[PDB]
mmCIF file with all atom_site columns, C-alpha atoms and ligand atoms in Angstrom:
data_model
loop_
_atom_site.group_PDB
_atom_site.id
_atom_site.type_symbol
_atom_site.label_atom_id
_atom_site.label_alt_id
_atom_site.label_comp_id
_atom_site.label_asym_id
_atom_site.label_entity_id
_atom_site.label_seq_id
_atom_site.pdbx_PDB_ins_code
_atom_site.Cartn_x
_atom_site.Cartn_y
_atom_site.Cartn_z
_atom_site.occupancy
_atom_site.B_iso_or_equiv
_atom_site.pdbx_formal_charge
_atom_site.auth_seq_id
_atom_site.auth_comp_id
_atom_site.auth_asym_id
_atom_site.auth_atom_id
_atom_site.pdbx_PDB_model_num
ATOM   1   C CA  . UNK A 1 1   ? 6.765   -6.591  -24.135 1.00 53.97 ? 1   UNK A CA  1
ATOM   2   C CA  . UNK A 1 2   ? 5.774   -7.687  -20.627 1.00 54.37 ? 2   UNK A CA  1
ATOM   3   C CA  . UNK A 1 3   ? 7.934   -8.184  -17.293 1.00 55.61 ? 3   UNK A CA  1
ATOM   4   C CA  . UNK A 1 4   ? 7.530   -12.261 -16.490 1.00 55.32 ? 4   UNK A CA  1
ATOM   5   C CA  . UNK A 1 5   ? 7.571   -11.163 -12.411 1.00 56.91 ? 5   UNK A CA  1
ATOM   6   C CA  . UNK A 1 6   ? 4.385   -9.434  -13.099 1.00 55.86 ? 6   UNK A CA  1
ATOM   7   C CA  . UNK A 1 7   ? 3.106   -11.656 -15.901 1.00 55.55 ? 7   UNK A CA  1
ATOM   8   C CA  . UNK A 1 8   ? 3.547   -14.445 -12.843 1.00 54.42 ? 8   UNK A CA  1
ATOM   9   C CA  . UNK A 1 9   ? 1.893   -11.953 -10.274 1.00 55.21 ? 9   UNK A CA  1
ATOM   10  C CA  . UNK A 1 10  ? -0.490  -10.869 -12.308 1.00 55.07 ? 10  UNK A CA  1
ATOM   11  C CA  . UNK A 1 11  ? -1.649  -15.233 -12.944 1.00 55.47 ? 11  UNK A CA  1
ATOM   12  C CA  . UNK A 1 12  ? -0.758  -15.880 -9.511  1.00 55.70 ? 12  UNK A CA  1
ATOM   13  C CA  . UNK A 1 13  ? -3.759  -12.769 -7.551  1.00 58.93 ? 13  UNK A CA  1
ATOM   14  C CA  . UNK A 1 14  ? -6.463  -11.098 -8.490  1.00 62.20 ? 14  UNK A CA  1
ATOM   15  C CA  . UNK A 1 15  ? -5.632  -7.438  -8.693  1.00 58.89 ? 15  UNK A CA  1
ATOM   16  C CA  . UNK A 1 16  ? -8.664  -5.177  -8.775  1.00 56.75 ? 16  UNK A CA  1
ATOM   17  C CA  . UNK A 1 17  ? -11.381 -7.609  -8.105  1.00 54.05 ? 17  UNK A CA  1
ATOM   18  C CA  . UNK A 1 18  ? -14.943 -7.129  -9.274  1.00 54.55 ? 18  UNK A CA  1
ATOM   19  C CA  . UNK A 1 19  ? -17.186 -8.278  -6.720  1.00 53.25 ? 19  UNK A CA  1
ATOM   20  C CA  . UNK A 1 20  ? -14.942 -6.809  -3.573  1.00 51.84 ? 20  UNK A CA  1
ATOM   21  C CA  . UNK A 1 21  ? -17.009 -6.219  -0.611  1.00 51.76 ? 21  UNK A CA  1
ATOM   22  C CA  . UNK A 1 22  ? -16.560 -2.031  -0.053  1.00 49.40 ? 22  UNK A CA  1
ATOM   23  C CA  . UNK A 1 23  ? -20.035 -2.111  2.140   1.00 49.18 ? 23  UNK A CA  1
ATOM   24  C CA  . UNK A 1 24  ? -17.555 -3.707  5.039   1.00 46.98 ? 24  UNK A CA  1
ATOM   25  C CA  . UNK A 1 25  ? -19.664 -5.947  8.037   1.00 50.12 ? 25  UNK A CA  1
ATOM   26  C CA  . UNK A 1 26  ? -16.377 -4.883  10.488  1.00 49.76 ? 26  UNK A CA  1
ATOM   27  C CA  . UNK A 1 27  ? -12.697 -3.822  9.534   1.00 46.15 ? 27  UNK A CA  1
ATOM   28  C CA  . UNK A 1 28  ? -10.172 -1.534  10.554  1.00 49.60 ? 28  UNK A CA  1
ATOM   29  C CA  . UNK A 1 29  ? -8.292  1.173   7.949   1.00 49.82 ? 29  UNK A CA  1
ATOM   30  C CA  . UNK A 1 30  ? -5.092  2.851   7.996   1.00 51.72 ? 30  UNK A CA  1
ATOM   31  C CA  . UNK A 1 31  ? -3.377  5.130   5.267   1.00 51.74 ? 31  UNK A CA  1
ATOM   32  C CA  . UNK A 1 32  ? -0.092  4.524   4.581   1.00 52.82 ? 32  UNK A CA  1
ATOM   33  C CA  . UNK A 1 33  ? 1.934   7.087   3.329   1.00 54.71 ? 33  UNK A CA  1
ATOM   34  C CA  . UNK A 1 34  ? 5.734   5.525   1.682   1.00 55.50 ? 34  UNK A CA  1
ATOM   35  C CA  . UNK A 1 35  ? 8.318   7.283   0.567   1.00 57.89 ? 35  UNK A CA  1
ATOM   36  C CA  . UNK A 1 36  ? 9.250   6.489   -2.589  1.00 59.36 ? 36  UNK A CA  1
ATOM   37  C CA  . UNK A 1 37  ? 7.180   3.800   -5.708  1.00 58.34 ? 37  UNK A CA  1
ATOM   38  C CA  . UNK A 1 38  ? 10.725  1.580   -5.253  1.00 59.92 ? 38  UNK A CA  1
ATOM   39  C CA  . UNK A 1 39  ? 8.982   0.731   -1.734  1.00 59.88 ? 39  UNK A CA  1
ATOM   40  C CA  . UNK A 1 40  ? 5.074   0.146   -3.271  1.00 56.42 ? 40  UNK A CA  1
ATOM   41  C CA  . UNK A 1 41  ? 6.910   -1.691  -5.839  1.00 53.90 ? 41  UNK A CA  1
ATOM   42  C CA  . UNK A 1 42  ? 9.140   -4.081  -3.716  1.00 55.91 ? 42  UNK A CA  1
ATOM   43  C CA  . UNK A 1 43  ? 6.233   -4.091  -1.526  1.00 54.34 ? 43  UNK A CA  1
ATOM   44  C CA  . UNK A 1 44  ? 3.441   -5.797  -4.038  1.00 54.17 ? 44  UNK A CA  1
ATOM   45  C CA  . UNK A 1 45  ? 6.553   -8.417  -5.287  1.00 53.99 ? 45  UNK A CA  1
ATOM   46  C CA  . UNK A 1 46  ? 7.496   -9.669  -1.992  1.00 50.18 ? 46  UNK A CA  1
ATOM   47  C CA  . UNK A 1 47  ? 4.540   -9.475  0.015   1.00 49.92 ? 47  UNK A CA  1
ATOM   48  C CA  . UNK A 1 48  ? 5.945   -7.415  2.557   1.00 50.61 ? 48  UNK A CA  1
ATOM   49  C CA  . UNK A 1 49  ? 5.892   -4.047  4.592   1.00 55.34 ? 49  UNK A CA  1
ATOM   50  C CA  . UNK A 1 50  ? 7.043   -1.736  7.068   1.00 54.32 ? 50  UNK A CA  1
ATOM   51  C CA  . UNK A 1 51  ? 6.570   1.371   8.570   1.00 55.29 ? 51  UNK A CA  1
ATOM   52  C CA  . UNK A 1 52  ? 8.099   3.369   11.183  1.00 59.52 ? 52  UNK A CA  1
ATOM   53  C CA  . UNK A 1 53  ? 8.760   1.595   14.247  1.00 60.74 ? 53  UNK A CA  1
ATOM   54  C CA  . UNK A 1 54  ? 6.165   4.099   15.789  1.00 61.70 ? 54  UNK A CA  1
ATOM   55  C CA  . UNK A 1 55  ? 3.904   3.164   12.656  1.00 60.13 ? 55  UNK A CA  1
ATOM   56  C CA  . UNK A 1 56  ? 4.587   -0.924  13.086  1.00 60.56 ? 56  UNK A CA  1
ATOM   57  C CA  . UNK A 1 57  ? 3.714   -0.961  16.609  1.00 62.25 ? 57  UNK A CA  1
ATOM   58  C CA  . UNK A 1 58  ? 0.311   1.417   16.010  1.00 61.21 ? 58  UNK A CA  1
ATOM   59  C CA  . UNK A 1 59  ? -0.375  -1.636  12.500  1.00 60.12 ? 59  UNK A CA  1
ATOM   60  C CA  . UNK A 1 60  ? 0.747   -3.800  15.304  1.00 60.10 ? 60  UNK A CA  1
ATOM   61  C CA  . UNK A 1 61  ? -2.160  -3.410  17.851  1.00 59.80 ? 61  UNK A CA  1
ATOM   62  C CA  . UNK A 1 62  ? -4.730  -3.217  15.177  1.00 60.29 ? 62  UNK A CA  1
ATOM   63  C CA  . UNK A 1 63  ? -3.979  -6.541  13.870  1.00 61.76 ? 63  UNK A CA  1
ATOM   64  C CA  . UNK A 1 64  ? -3.827  -8.347  17.140  1.00 61.28 ? 64  UNK A CA  1
ATOM   65  C CA  . UNK A 1 65  ? -7.569  -6.344  17.971  1.00 59.80 ? 65  UNK A CA  1
ATOM   66  C CA  . UNK A 1 66  ? -8.595  -7.663  15.507  1.00 59.03 ? 66  UNK A CA  1
ATOM   67  C CA  . UNK A 1 67  ? -8.674  -11.219 16.449  1.00 57.81 ? 67  UNK A CA  1
ATOM   68  C CA  . UNK A 1 68  ? -9.747  -12.044 12.201  1.00 56.17 ? 68  UNK A CA  1
ATOM   69  C CA  . UNK A 1 69  ? -12.782 -10.965 13.393  1.00 56.08 ? 69  UNK A CA  1
ATOM   70  C CA  . UNK A 1 70  ? -12.162 -8.947  10.039  1.00 58.14 ? 70  UNK A CA  1
ATOM   71  C CA  . UNK A 1 71  ? -10.094 -7.709  7.835   1.00 57.82 ? 71  UNK A CA  1
ATOM   72  C CA  . UNK A 1 72  ? -7.185  -4.615  8.989   1.00 58.85 ? 72  UNK A CA  1
ATOM   73  C CA  . UNK A 1 73  ? -7.054  -3.017  4.920   1.00 61.87 ? 73  UNK A CA  1
ATOM   74  C CA  . UNK A 1 74  ? -4.101  -0.589  3.965   1.00 64.08 ? 74  UNK A CA  1
ATOM   75  C CA  . UNK A 1 75  ? -4.905  2.551   1.719   1.00 61.27 ? 75  UNK A CA  1
ATOM   76  C CA  . UNK A 1 76  ? -1.404  3.257   0.018   1.00 65.19 ? 76  UNK A CA  1
ATOM   77  C CA  . UNK A 1 77  ? -0.259  6.466   -1.491  1.00 62.63 ? 77  UNK A CA  1
ATOM   78  C CA  . UNK A 1 78  ? 3.770   7.678   -1.407  1.00 60.56 ? 78  UNK A CA  1
ATOM   79  C CA  . UNK A 1 79  ? 4.205   11.100  -0.361  1.00 59.68 ? 79  UNK A CA  1
ATOM   80  C CA  . UNK A 1 80  ? 4.468   14.306  -2.805  1.00 60.12 ? 80  UNK A CA  1
ATOM   81  C CA  . UNK A 1 81  ? 2.021   11.564  -5.203  1.00 61.11 ? 81  UNK A CA  1
ATOM   82  C CA  . UNK A 1 82  ? -1.115  13.217  -6.009  1.00 64.28 ? 82  UNK A CA  1
ATOM   83  C CA  . UNK A 1 83  ? -3.197  10.264  -5.477  1.00 64.33 ? 83  UNK A CA  1
ATOM   84  C CA  . UNK A 1 84  ? -3.486  6.551   -4.509  1.00 63.78 ? 84  UNK A CA  1
ATOM   85  C CA  . UNK A 1 85  ? -2.180  3.738   -5.917  1.00 64.07 ? 85  UNK A CA  1
ATOM   86  C CA  . UNK A 1 86  ? -3.428  0.838   -4.493  1.00 62.27 ? 86  UNK A CA  1
ATOM   87  C CA  . UNK A 1 87  ? -4.681  -0.993  -1.645  1.00 60.32 ? 87  UNK A CA  1
ATOM   88  C CA  . UNK A 1 88  ? -3.478  -3.825  0.509   1.00 62.06 ? 88  UNK A CA  1
ATOM   89  C CA  . UNK A 1 89  ? -4.604  -6.570  3.364   1.00 62.73 ? 89  UNK A CA  1
ATOM   90  C CA  . UNK A 1 90  ? -2.875  -6.708  6.368   1.00 60.74 ? 90  UNK A CA  1
ATOM   91  C CA  . UNK A 1 91  ? -1.819  -10.882 7.138   1.00 62.75 ? 91  UNK A CA  1
ATOM   92  C CA  . UNK A 1 92  ? 0.319   -11.229 9.470   1.00 62.21 ? 92  UNK A CA  1
ATOM   93  C CA  . UNK A 1 93  ? 1.535   -9.379  13.116  1.00 58.00 ? 93  UNK A CA  1
ATOM   94  C CA  . UNK A 1 94  ? 4.888   -7.213  12.762  1.00 57.51 ? 94  UNK A CA  1
ATOM   95  C CA  . UNK A 1 95  ? 7.856   -9.928  13.501  1.00 57.39 ? 95  UNK A CA  1
ATOM   96  C CA  . UNK A 1 96  ? 10.943  -7.858  14.425  1.00 54.60 ? 96  UNK A CA  1
ATOM   97  C CA  . UNK A 1 97  ? 13.326  -3.425  12.372  1.00 53.84 ? 97  UNK A CA  1
ATOM   98  C CA  . UNK A 1 98  ? 10.260  -4.864  11.708  1.00 53.81 ? 98  UNK A CA  1
ATOM   99  C CA  . UNK A 1 99  ? 7.833   -6.292  8.224   1.00 55.55 ? 99  UNK A CA  1
ATOM   100 C CA  . UNK A 1 100 ? 4.465   -7.424  8.305   1.00 56.47 ? 100 UNK A CA  1
ATOM   101 C CA  . UNK A 1 101 ? 2.542   -9.653  5.541   1.00 57.50 ? 101 UNK A CA  1
ATOM   102 C CA  . UNK A 1 102 ? 0.380   -7.849  3.505   1.00 59.09 ? 102 UNK A CA  1
ATOM   103 C CA  . UNK A 1 103 ? -1.563  -9.377  0.603   1.00 59.06 ? 103 UNK A CA  1
ATOM   104 C CA  . UNK A 1 104 ? -2.355  -6.114  -2.502  1.00 57.64 ? 104 UNK A CA  1
ATOM   105 C CA  . UNK A 1 105 ? -5.703  -6.174  -3.530  1.00 61.12 ? 105 UNK A CA  1
ATOM   106 C CA  . UNK A 1 106 ? -6.692  -3.154  -5.503  1.00 60.03 ? 106 UNK A CA  1
ATOM   107 C CA  . UNK A 1 107 ? -3.049  -2.019  -7.789  1.00 61.48 ? 107 UNK A CA  1
ATOM   108 C CA  . UNK A 1 108 ? -4.723  1.314   -9.984  1.00 61.43 ? 108 UNK A CA  1
ATOM   109 C CA  . UNK A 1 109 ? -4.155  5.202   -9.471  1.00 64.16 ? 109 UNK A CA  1
ATOM   110 C CA  . UNK A 1 110 ? -7.152  7.138   -7.858  1.00 61.09 ? 110 UNK A CA  1
ATOM   111 C CA  . UNK A 1 111 ? -6.026  11.097  -8.102  1.00 61.10 ? 111 UNK A CA  1
ATOM   112 C CA  . UNK A 1 112 ? -7.073  12.297  -4.911  1.00 63.32 ? 112 UNK A CA  1
ATOM   113 C CA  . UNK A 1 113 ? -9.649  14.613  -6.644  1.00 62.80 ? 113 UNK A CA  1
ATOM   114 C CA  . UNK A 1 114 ? -12.635 11.899  -6.410  1.00 61.01 ? 114 UNK A CA  1
ATOM   115 C CA  . UNK A 1 115 ? -11.067 11.777  -2.567  1.00 62.59 ? 115 UNK A CA  1
ATOM   116 C CA  . UNK A 1 116 ? -10.749 15.011  -1.365  1.00 61.10 ? 116 UNK A CA  1
ATOM   117 C CA  . UNK A 1 117 ? -14.503 15.227  -0.617  1.00 62.27 ? 117 UNK A CA  1
ATOM   118 C CA  . UNK A 1 118 ? -14.313 12.602  2.502   1.00 59.99 ? 118 UNK A CA  1
ATOM   119 C CA  . UNK A 1 119 ? -13.072 14.057  5.379   1.00 57.72 ? 119 UNK A CA  1
ATOM   120 C CA  . UNK A 1 120 ? -12.316 11.956  9.063   1.00 57.53 ? 120 UNK A CA  1
ATOM   121 C CA  . UNK A 1 121 ? -13.856 13.853  11.603  1.00 57.99 ? 121 UNK A CA  1
ATOM   122 C CA  . UNK A 1 122 ? -10.497 11.869  14.417  1.00 55.22 ? 122 UNK A CA  1
ATOM   123 C CA  . UNK A 1 123 ? -8.051  14.620  12.309  1.00 54.17 ? 123 UNK A CA  1
ATOM   124 C CA  . UNK A 1 124 ? -9.460  17.898  12.701  1.00 52.17 ? 124 UNK A CA  1
ATOM   125 C CA  . UNK A 1 125 ? -11.539 17.274  9.059   1.00 50.41 ? 125 UNK A CA  1
ATOM   126 C CA  . UNK A 1 126 ? -9.119  16.914  7.048   1.00 52.65 ? 126 UNK A CA  1
ATOM   127 C CA  . UNK A 1 127 ? -9.329  15.540  3.892   1.00 54.96 ? 127 UNK A CA  1
ATOM   128 C CA  . UNK A 1 128 ? -8.296  12.073  3.245   1.00 56.59 ? 128 UNK A CA  1
ATOM   129 C CA  . UNK A 1 129 ? -6.023  12.788  0.880   1.00 60.09 ? 129 UNK A CA  1
ATOM   130 C CA  . UNK A 1 130 ? -3.954  14.874  3.472   1.00 59.42 ? 130 UNK A CA  1
ATOM   131 C CA  . UNK A 1 131 ? -3.620  11.893  6.092   1.00 58.89 ? 131 UNK A CA  1
ATOM   132 C CA  . UNK A 1 132 ? -0.602  10.572  7.330   1.00 59.29 ? 132 UNK A CA  1
ATOM   133 C CA  . UNK A 1 133 ? 1.618   7.344   7.919   1.00 58.99 ? 133 UNK A CA  1
ATOM   134 C CA  . UNK A 1 134 ? -0.995  5.107   10.010  1.00 57.25 ? 134 UNK A CA  1
ATOM   135 C CA  . UNK A 1 135 ? -3.772  7.265   10.048  1.00 54.42 ? 135 UNK A CA  1
ATOM   136 C CA  . UNK A 1 136 ? -6.673  5.993   10.771  1.00 55.82 ? 136 UNK A CA  1
ATOM   137 C CA  . UNK A 1 137 ? -9.888  5.826   8.746   1.00 56.34 ? 137 UNK A CA  1
ATOM   138 C CA  . UNK A 1 138 ? -13.414 5.870   10.626  1.00 58.46 ? 138 UNK A CA  1
ATOM   139 C CA  . UNK A 1 139 ? -14.996 2.641   9.062   1.00 56.84 ? 139 UNK A CA  1
ATOM   140 C CA  . UNK A 1 140 ? -17.925 4.941   7.754   1.00 54.92 ? 140 UNK A CA  1
ATOM   141 C CA  . UNK A 1 141 ? -15.305 7.273   6.217   1.00 54.64 ? 141 UNK A CA  1
ATOM   142 C CA  . UNK A 1 142 ? -13.357 3.777   4.988   1.00 53.53 ? 142 UNK A CA  1
ATOM   143 C CA  . UNK A 1 143 ? -16.670 2.466   3.389   1.00 51.46 ? 143 UNK A CA  1
ATOM   144 C CA  . UNK A 1 144 ? -16.666 5.319   1.001   1.00 47.90 ? 144 UNK A CA  1
ATOM   145 C CA  . UNK A 1 145 ? -13.018 5.393   0.273   1.00 51.54 ? 145 UNK A CA  1
ATOM   146 C CA  . UNK A 1 146 ? -13.307 2.064   0.204   1.00 47.45 ? 146 UNK A CA  1
ATOM   147 C CA  . UNK A 1 147 ? -15.955 1.495   -2.709  1.00 50.33 ? 147 UNK A CA  1
ATOM   148 C CA  . UNK A 1 148 ? -14.802 4.942   -4.739  1.00 51.09 ? 148 UNK A CA  1
ATOM   149 C CA  . UNK A 1 149 ? -11.303 3.084   -5.249  1.00 48.82 ? 149 UNK A CA  1
ATOM   150 C CA  . UNK A 1 150 ? -13.404 -0.205  -6.149  1.00 49.62 ? 150 UNK A CA  1
ATOM   151 C CA  . UNK A 1 151 ? -15.302 1.620   -9.022  1.00 50.84 ? 151 UNK A CA  1
ATOM   152 C CA  . UNK A 1 152 ? -12.962 3.976   -9.720  1.00 51.50 ? 152 UNK A CA  1
ATOM   153 C CA  . UNK A 1 153 ? -12.347 3.183   -14.008 1.00 52.68 ? 153 UNK A CA  1
ATOM   154 C CA  . UNK A 1 154 ? -8.332  3.768   -13.770 1.00 56.51 ? 154 UNK A CA  1
ATOM   155 C CA  . UNK A 1 155 ? -6.110  4.881   -16.619 1.00 52.99 ? 155 UNK A CA  1
ATOM   156 C CA  . UNK A 1 156 ? -2.608  3.411   -15.303 1.00 54.30 ? 156 UNK A CA  1
ATOM   157 C CA  . UNK A 1 157 ? -1.559  1.975   -12.492 1.00 54.17 ? 157 UNK A CA  1
ATOM   158 C CA  . UNK A 1 158 ? 2.659   0.772   -10.955 1.00 56.02 ? 158 UNK A CA  1
ATOM   159 C CA  . UNK A 1 159 ? 1.961   -2.122  -12.930 1.00 53.79 ? 159 UNK A CA  1
ATOM   160 C CA  . UNK A 1 160 ? 2.313   0.616   -16.191 1.00 53.00 ? 160 UNK A CA  1
ATOM   161 C CA  . UNK A 1 161 ? 6.032   1.123   -14.806 1.00 59.52 ? 161 UNK A CA  1
ATOM   162 C CA  . UNK A 1 162 ? 7.181   -2.158  -13.419 1.00 61.71 ? 162 UNK A CA  1
ATOM   163 C CA  . UNK A 1 163 ? 9.998   -3.507  -15.565 1.00 66.23 ? 163 UNK A CA  1
ATOM   164 C CA  . UNK A 1 164 ? 11.313  -0.006  -14.788 1.00 67.86 ? 164 UNK A CA  1
ATOM   165 C CA  . UNK A 1 165 ? 11.378  -0.903  -11.203 1.00 67.31 ? 165 UNK A CA  1
ATOM   166 C CA  . UNK A 1 166 ? 12.458  -4.197  -11.532 1.00 67.30 ? 166 UNK A CA  1
ATOM   167 C CA  . UNK A 1 167 ? 16.256  -3.052  -13.531 1.00 66.44 ? 167 UNK A CA  1
ATOM   168 C CA  . UNK A 1 168 ? 16.487  -0.401  -11.080 1.00 68.96 ? 168 UNK A CA  1
ATOM   169 C CA  . UNK A 1 169 ? 16.627  -2.590  -8.138  1.00 69.55 ? 169 UNK A CA  1
ATOM   170 C CA  . UNK A 1 170 ? 18.979  -5.178  -9.815  1.00 70.41 ? 170 UNK A CA  1
ATOM   171 C CA  . UNK A 1 171 ? 21.458  -1.745  -11.034 1.00 67.66 ? 171 UNK A CA  1
ATOM   172 C CA  . UNK A 1 172 ? 21.226  -0.881  -7.263  1.00 69.29 ? 172 UNK A CA  1
ATOM   173 C CA  . UNK A 1 173 ? 22.287  -3.778  -5.993  1.00 70.54 ? 173 UNK A CA  1
ATOM   174 C CA  . UNK A 1 174 ? 25.179  -4.034  -8.086  1.00 70.97 ? 174 UNK A CA  1
ATOM   175 C CA  . UNK A 1 175 ? 26.306  -0.179  -7.518  1.00 67.83 ? 175 UNK A CA  1
ATOM   176 C CA  . UNK A 1 176 ? 25.942  -1.718  -3.816  1.00 69.94 ? 176 UNK A CA  1
ATOM   177 C CA  . UNK A 1 177 ? 28.179  -4.700  -3.847  1.00 67.97 ? 177 UNK A CA  1
ATOM   178 C CA  . UNK A 1 178 ? 30.519  -2.791  -6.023  1.00 68.09 ? 178 UNK A CA  1
ATOM   179 C CA  . UNK A 1 179 ? 30.714  -0.148  -3.632  1.00 70.95 ? 179 UNK A CA  1
ATOM   180 C CA  . UNK A 1 180 ? 30.735  -2.620  -0.608  1.00 69.00 ? 180 UNK A CA  1
ATOM   181 C CA  . UNK A 1 181 ? 34.207  -4.912  -2.732  1.00 71.26 ? 181 UNK A CA  1
ATOM   182 C CA  . UNK A 1 182 ? 35.745  -1.237  -3.113  1.00 69.46 ? 182 UNK A CA  1
ATOM   183 C CA  . UNK A 1 183 ? 35.668  -1.063  0.821   1.00 70.57 ? 183 UNK A CA  1
ATOM   184 C CA  . UNK A 1 184 ? 38.413  -4.109  1.524   1.00 75.32 ? 184 UNK A CA  1
HETATM 185 S S1  . LIG B 2 .   ? 11.312  -3.084  4.703   1.00 77.47 ? 1   LIG B S1  1
HETATM 186 C C1  . LIG B 2 .   ? 10.263  -2.477  3.260   1.00 77.47 ? 1   LIG B C1  1
HETATM 187 C C2  . LIG B 2 .   ? 9.726   -3.877  2.457   1.00 77.47 ? 1   LIG B C2  1
HETATM 188 C C3  . LIG B 2 .   ? 8.720   -3.584  1.773   1.00 77.47 ? 1   LIG B C3  1
HETATM 189 C C4  . LIG B 2 .   ? 8.651   -2.492  0.732   1.00 77.47 ? 1   LIG B C4  1
HETATM 190 C C5  . LIG B 2 .   ? 9.784   -1.738  2.016   1.00 77.47 ? 1   LIG B C5  1
HETATM 191 C C6  . LIG B 2 .   ? 10.336  -2.126  3.177   1.00 77.47 ? 1   LIG B C6  1
HETATM 192 C C7  . LIG B 2 .   ? 12.082  -1.144  2.693   1.00 77.47 ? 1   LIG B C7  1
HETATM 193 O O1  . LIG B 2 .   ? 12.601  -1.113  3.033   1.00 77.47 ? 1   LIG B O1  1
HETATM 194 N N1  . LIG B 2 .   ? 11.672  0.750   3.409   1.00 77.47 ? 1   LIG B N1  1
HETATM 195 C C8  . LIG B 2 .   ? 12.359  1.324   3.141   1.00 77.47 ? 1   LIG B C8  1
HETATM 196 C C9  . LIG B 2 .   ? 11.414  2.750   4.011   1.00 77.47 ? 1   LIG B C9  1
HETATM 197 N N2  . LIG B 2 .   ? 10.713  2.437   5.336   1.00 77.47 ? 1   LIG B N2  1
HETATM 198 C C10 . LIG B 2 .   ? 10.650  3.876   6.153   1.00 77.47 ? 1   LIG B C10 1
HETATM 199 C C11 . LIG B 2 .   ? 9.559   3.839   7.272   1.00 77.47 ? 1   LIG B C11 1
HETATM 200 O O2  . LIG B 2 .   ? 10.629  2.943   8.409   1.00 77.47 ? 1   LIG B O2  1
HETATM 201 C C12 . LIG B 2 .   ? 10.864  2.062   7.382   1.00 77.47 ? 1   LIG B C12 1
HETATM 202 C C13 . LIG B 2 .   ? 11.420  2.005   6.343   1.00 77.47 ? 1   LIG B C13 1
#
């Protein structure tokens, strides 16, 4: 049983492409720390993201500075998960509490133990796996991360729980409408 939303997305997008250029000629790369799986699922299916107010202004500034002279890539992980879950390219400036277009490219779980050896000089030389939201990754270390994420032979991804997230969204909307209706 495969869900038609996911079937539609997989046919319209080339997720986890075999020929991905990790040795970037230019670009900027940022960590995104999400609060929940549900937000990741929502972002993949609608091609949008919202950071915090401060996070939005940092990504807005970076995208407009890049002026399409190179990509802005976002490396996604939810707080506490122990893996990265995909990478998207930022595709629009922030629109105002503030959302922007993203294009998901990799959707796959990469355990933190494959990336912990990469450390970020611009964040007290901490592992890239102990970053906060919108932490920027230096270009050479971004190449190392993207090469590992691109080539890692993943065993699972959020897509394996896709129908679960669909039902969760649908139930949440009905619970809210009933609750709003009882307040009137
Ligand atoms: S608005 C959006 C778009 C795509 C995926 C998730 C979301 C979302 O609703 N996020 C809610 C929590 N955010 C945390 C950071 O501050 C903004 C809201």
